[PDB]
């Protein structure tokens, strides 16, 4: 399914909040 596509966008997000 598309579970690796969520872990990649889910992380770029965590770094997006630190900015």
């Amino acid at each position: 399914g598309e579970e690796e596509l969520a872990e990649k966008a889910a992380e770029f997000a965590r770094e997006l909040a630190n900015y």
Side-chain angles (χ1 to χ4, degrees), residues 1-2 5-6 8-10 12-14 16-19:
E2 302 185 60
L5 297 70
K8 259 181 180 61
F12 316 146
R14 300 297 199 186
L16 207 180
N18 328 167
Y19 156 68

